[PDB]
Amino acid sequence: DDNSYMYILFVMFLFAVTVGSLILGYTRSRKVDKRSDPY
Amino acid sequence: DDNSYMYILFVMFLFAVTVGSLILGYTRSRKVDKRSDPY
Amino acid sequence: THVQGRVYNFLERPTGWKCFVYHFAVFLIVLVCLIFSVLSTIEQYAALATGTLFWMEIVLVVFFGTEYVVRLWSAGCRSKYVGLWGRLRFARKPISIIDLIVVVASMVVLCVGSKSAIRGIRFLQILRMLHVDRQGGTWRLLGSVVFIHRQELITTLYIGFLGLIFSSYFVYLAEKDAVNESGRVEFGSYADALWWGVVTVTTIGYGDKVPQTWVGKTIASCFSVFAISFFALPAGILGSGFALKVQQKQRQKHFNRQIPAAASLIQTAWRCYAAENPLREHHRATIKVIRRMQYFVAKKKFQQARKPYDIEQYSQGHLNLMVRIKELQRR
Amino acid sequence: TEEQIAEFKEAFSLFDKDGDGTITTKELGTVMRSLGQNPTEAELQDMINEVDADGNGTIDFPEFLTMMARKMKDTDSEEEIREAFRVFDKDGNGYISAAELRHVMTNLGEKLTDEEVDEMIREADIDGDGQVNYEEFVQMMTAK
Amino acid sequence: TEEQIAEFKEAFSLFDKDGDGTITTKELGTVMRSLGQNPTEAELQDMINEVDADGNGTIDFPEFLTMMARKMKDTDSEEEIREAFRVFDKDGNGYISAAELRHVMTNLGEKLTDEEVDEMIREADIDGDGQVNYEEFVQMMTAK
Ligand SMILES: [Ca+2]
Ligand SMILES: [Ca+2]
Ligand SMILES: [Ca+2]
Ligand SMILES: [Ca+2]
């Protein structure tokens, strides 16, 4: 295990990019009104 | 073969979930009239 | 009431360029912590995980132990639950049942280890990835696309599991007593032949178990093609099902935009007709300016509520049909 | 049209509280607030963004006259209001009941007063039934 | 309408066998059974679910009068019956033959008697041909 920190860092960093994109999508969301659509 | 019962149990249990879903779908079905649709 | 509701909108269903920072940064701290935790098992980088990591874990559970109570106290700004007895159904929300398990179980494990102990911190440090993705907006997509497509998924899993149960028994009958090139027997039991079935039905092909007798290779060929198809099916099924549900949210999200701009035109056109009757005279001399002024803004908003559609070239079945009725209607 | 093209310019520069040829969009946010509106600056900058077709913000009526010279009653703006009923139409025919029209009148967009929305559907429900038809309304909006 | 708004209330509370202001949905399952219907309780609870717009089950005619005050002959319920022919239409034009109309009349939904369905298509097939047109029927249903 010479450079074995690299694998952990890389997989965790891809997961971080994906989760960060999810959070940007939810924050940059527009409204949170639950039941106001068909009325 | 120390914990080798686990593999058999798990595969057979996934098959059981699938077949049980099939049976629920066929029972929770509504009607069984064979030839009454286009008349 | 202002403060509690503000704190709710901030910690749950959050919005605004700074809420992003807060939440994603808590998540990045969780990620650094889990990275150091998984590097504490390399046996050569284990010196990096000293006791300051443990105290950075106890200040982390100190932070979450008041974070949960802040989100509990800021829950009474909801019509679904009020007070203290109503707020128990706020703690039926499974992200909160996950979060409570995380904070209390990690606190309990940290208490007994401070008076296999450090190993329990890894699971309750992996679990803190799930609780910062709020609103459950990802699992609600998958749990509905699977439910819409329940028939085809149940069908192909039943056919694939039947082919796996059947044809990974004929291999065991063809390979019950046959040795490897290195002196061991591969298909010793049925479970070995079924490990093989799952592995070769999902096209992994590790290579620990290959059937050696020439009867078993034929069965492996047949079952290979005729069940690799039925196990590769749900990728295409859910691939259509995910791209068809987001397009069914970008219909109703545009239809939620169209309605207040189809209200702001009619409610303003009635205002523009009501110029007869709302010194009381020169005050009415000014309102005729504004009722014609904002009406054009509402007119621009209504034409911006229908002309930008979304995949915006979806008029390609009804190109001339929207005009060929209206010009007939004018005659 | 010859009798209105003179005294309208007295009300045109009336918002600037001076004699300059200015529509005074910066002072319109004080004039409408004095009238009792008090909007935000975002909607205030949106007013002359489409009202004044020149583009400056204060004008010697190139489009302040053309805002007056747009009657909003001919067949170029009579179908666009008729499409606003069609967003609310269910099961065709312009079914819109007095209860549903009161539901959509006091809730969405820029809301009316109750003394306005209570009598708005009065002349459109002369038969007293549960269908305020759009053609009976745009005939009242034909002189709008 | 002034001559019918009084004696109708004698038949309105006639199902309860008393003088109370009650539509008597619990007693309607005995009254209609005495008339010769005998429905299930599921369809009986479905009757006042849409008949009585109040929601209790027994009423002093808010909607029992409005059930009478719904003539089912104007252009709000004349296209919905005209859509029921369109589910049976093949190759357009309202082709529906007397044999096909008798086939669909005695088989599906809530069936008529043979003495009713035998003479139902009689006035809609005055020409004697194989096309009972829907417009010749809704003109007979124009007074319905
Ligand atoms: Ca100026
Ligand atoms: Ca300008
Ligand atoms: Ca009663
Ligand atoms: Ca009632």
- Kindly tell me the burial class for residue D10, based on how many C-beta atoms sit within 10 Å of its own C-beta (0-12, 13-18, 19 or more): exposed
Tell whether E52 is in a known binding site. Answer: yes
- What's the rounded Cα separation, in Å, for the pair E6 and E68? 13
- What's the rounded Cα separation, in Å, for the pair E125 and D96? 37
- Distances in Å between the Cα of D138 and the Cα atoms of C195, C302, C306, D73, D143 are 74, 17, 21, 9, 9
Across-strand partners of C179? C185
CATH 3.40.640.10 corresponds to the domain E75-141: no
Same fold, E1-74 and E75-141: yes
Across-strand partners of C185? C179
Top residue of C158, C161, C209 to mutate, by most chain B CBs within 10 Å, is C161
For ligand 1, a single-atom ion, the residues with CB < 5 A are: D 22, 24, 58
Would you list the domain boundaries of chain D?
Answer: 1-74, 75-141
Give the annotated binding-site residues of C. Answer: 135
Cα angle vertex C309, ends C307, C311, to 5°? Answer: 140
Measure in Å the smallest separation between the Cα of E80 and chain D Cα atoms.
9
Q: Where are the beta strands (DSSP E) in C21-82?
A: none
- What's the rounded Cα separation, in Å, for the pair C81 and C75? 8
Of residues C205, C171, C165, the one with CA closest to residue C188: C171
By CA distance, what is C273's nearest residue in D? D144
**Closest partner residue to C302 among D68, D84, D104, by Cβ?**
D84
- What's the rounded Cα separation, in Å, for the pair C165 and C155? 15
Of residues C163, C170, C229, the one with CA closest to residue C198: C163
Question: Which chains have at least 3 CB atom pairs separated by less than 8 Å from chain B?
Answer: C
Contact (Cβ atoms closer than 8 angstroms) between residue C270 and residue D120: yes
Tell whether E38 is in a known binding site. Answer: no
Across-strand partners of C248? none
Residue labelled with tokens 């192909």: C156
Q: How many beta-carbon contacts under 8 Å exist across C and D?
A: 85
Measure in Å the smallest separation between the Cα of B21 and chain C Cα atoms.
7
Tell whether E63 is in a known binding site. Answer: yes
Residue C122 identity: R
- What's the rounded Cα separation, in Å, for the pair E123 and E141? 12
**Closest partner residue to A12 among C9, C34, C43, by Cβ?**
C34
Q: Give D55 Cα–ligand 2 centroid separation in angstroms.
A: 4
Helices within C113-248 (DSSP H only): 120-126, 139-148, 150-174, 190-201, 214-245
CA dihedral C188, C194, C200, C206 (to 10 degrees): -50
Question: Do the two chains B and A touch, given a threshold of 8 Å on CB pairs and at least 3 pairs?
Answer: no
Say which residues have a Cβ less than 8 Å from residue D70's Cβ, sequence separation at least 6. C296, D77
For ligand 2, a single-atom ion, the residues with CB < 5 A are: D 52, 54, 56, 59
- What's the rounded Cα separation, in Å, for the pair D27 and D24? 5
Residues 119-138 on D with a CB inside 8 Å of E are 131
- What's the rounded Cα separation, in Å, for the pair C176 and D94? 77
CA dihedral C159, C161, C165, C167 (to 10 degrees): 60
- What's the rounded Cα separation, in Å, for the pair C161 and E71? 61
Method of determination used here: cryo-EM
Contact (Cβ atoms closer than 8 angstroms) between residue D94 and residue D85: yes
- What's the rounded Cα separation, in Å, for the pair C224 and C227? 6
- Kindly tell me the burial class for residue A13, based on how many C-beta atoms sit within 10 Å of its own C-beta (0-12, 13-18, 19 or more): exposed
Q: How many beta-carbon contacts under 8 Å exist across A and C?
A: 60
Of residues C298, C287, C294, the one with CA closest to residue C264: C298
By CA distance, what is C255's nearest residue in D? D87
Measure in Å the smallest separation between the Cα of D71 and chain C Cα atoms.
10
Domain E1-74: CATH class, spelled out: mainly alpha
C27/A28 touch (CB, cutoff 8 Å), yes or no? no
CA dihedral D122, D123, D128, D129 (to 10 degrees): -100
Contact (Cβ atoms closer than 8 angstroms) between residue D15 and residue D28: yes
Handedness of CA C207, C208, C213, C216 (dihedral sign): negative
By CA distance, what is C153's nearest residue in B? B18
Question: Is the minimum CB–CB distance between D115 and chain C shorter than 8 Å?
Answer: no
Backbone dihedral region of E109: left (phi > 0), alpha (psi from -120 to 50 degrees) or beta?
left
Measure in Å the smallest separation between the Cα of B38 and chain C Cα atoms.
24
Q: Around E3, how many Cα atoms within 13 Å sit in the side-chain half-sphere?
A: 0
Handedness of CA E95, E98, E100, E106 (dihedral sign): positive
- What's the rounded Cα separation, in Å, for the pair C292 and C269? 9
Contact (Cβ atoms closer than 8 angstroms) between residue E133 and residue E82: no
